Every structure is written in C-alpha cells, then in structure tokens.
C-alpha cells in the first residue's frame, strides 16, 4: 500500500483545464487527500475545457475546484492554496512539504524552475504533465528525488517539441495522464513518455530510454 496512490497526499499545482480534470479523476478513484494550488480566477473562456461550470466563474480556481472535489466522495479531503507557488509564509511552505506526490499541471517553465529551487526537505514523487497547444500530444514526466530535476525534464520536453483543443481532447489527456500518475506512484522512478492522439482518438506513445 506504499505504492497505492489512494494512500498518498497529492498536491496538484495548476487548477486549469488539465489539472482540474486530473484532480476530479483522482478523487473519484479514491485519492481523497489532495491539495490544489492556483492563484488565478476561473474565467468564462475556460469552461469549454474545464471540470467546473458557470457557478465557479469569477472565483479562485483552487478554492472552487476544492469545493467541487469535496462533494464527489464522502471521505474527500481536498484543501485549497490560493497563493502562487512558492508561498511566502513558512507555514504555507511547511503545509506543501507534507504532500507526497507533487503534480505540475501548469505548462509553465517558471514553475519547473520554482519546483527545483524549492526546498522540499525530503524525497518526493514529482510529475509534470502538459499538452501541446492544439492538444495533439501530451508530455508526461516523472521523477523520485529530493529536488526536482528541471534540467532533465526540460531536455525531454525540448526533444519532443490539428484544431483548437476541445473538452474531449483534454479529457482524453486527463485520462491518459491519470493512468500515468497511477503507474508512476506504483513503480516510482525516472520516467518520460510522450503521447500523440490520432483523429479517431487512438493514442500512440514514445517513451524515453534512460
């Protein structure tokens, strides 16, 4: 059960299109101890490819997502962080250090660097997930380290790098990405996979051979 994600405290950085859908999937399978970190408001333009609805527009994305997540299962125990990463409070920093699995769903290079500069104080499972801009592909990176390996993650993304992304595109990658997360936590290590979707929704894969 030390390789069961359901027993892990999981932090999701980024409560946008991909992160919100991944968080919902993880909650439904029983990952009840989730932290959601996002400083930005949910915008009406987001709803074409988001987990939430108009009732959350204008609210903080993390707080609104957590309210939703905690209504999915009786034992849901999601907590919101409405600050940017990294927090300023040492209290907030210690709160983030309690999580076992750190999932970056921002697509932001600045967040990759912040993860590497943050002092996590112990070994974490790090996962970074993001899509190409038309959602034709999914970058999937994982590492089990005391510090996030930004240099390796960047080189993997760079080596891998037809209409606007729709809800079905993002839900497809949230599902693939949820399965990736579960596979990583079950057998942690240095892992990189790049997925591509075909027009009929089939999915091909190219893993990196370390």
């Amino acid at each position: 059960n030390a390789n069961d994600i359901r027993s892990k405290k999981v932090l999701i950085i980024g409560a946008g299109s991909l992160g919100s859908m991944i968080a919902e999937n993880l909650m439904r399978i029983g990952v009840v101890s989730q932290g959601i970190l996002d400083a930005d408001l949910l915008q009406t333009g987001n709803l074409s490819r988001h987990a939430l609805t108009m009732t959350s527009v204008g609210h903080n994305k993390a707080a609104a997502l957590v309210e939703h997540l905690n209504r999915i299962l009786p034992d849901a125990s999601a907590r919101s962080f409405s600050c940017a990463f990294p927090p300023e409070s040492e209290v907030a920093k210690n709160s983030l250090r309690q999580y076992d699995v750190i999932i970056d769903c921002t697509g932001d290079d600045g967040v990759l660097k912040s993860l590497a500069a943050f002092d996590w104080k112990s070994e974490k499972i790090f996962i970074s997930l993001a899509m190409t801009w038309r959602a034709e592909g999914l970058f999937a990176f994982a590492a089990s380290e005391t510090s996030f390996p930004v240099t390796d993650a960047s080189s993997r993304f760079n080596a891998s790098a037809v209409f606007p992304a729709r809800a079905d595109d993002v839900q497809l990658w949230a599902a693939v990405g949820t399965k990736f997360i579960c596979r990583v936590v079950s057998a942690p290590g240095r892992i990189y996979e790049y997925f591509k979707q075909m027009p009929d929704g089939t999915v091909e894969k190219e893993p990196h051979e370390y």
Binding site: G107, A130, T132, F139
Partner: peptide
C-alpha cells in the same frame, strides 16, 4: 510554454 506548454498547455495545461
């Protein structure tokens, strides 16, 4: 960067 990338899209998420």
């Amino acid at each position: 960067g990338r899209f998420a």
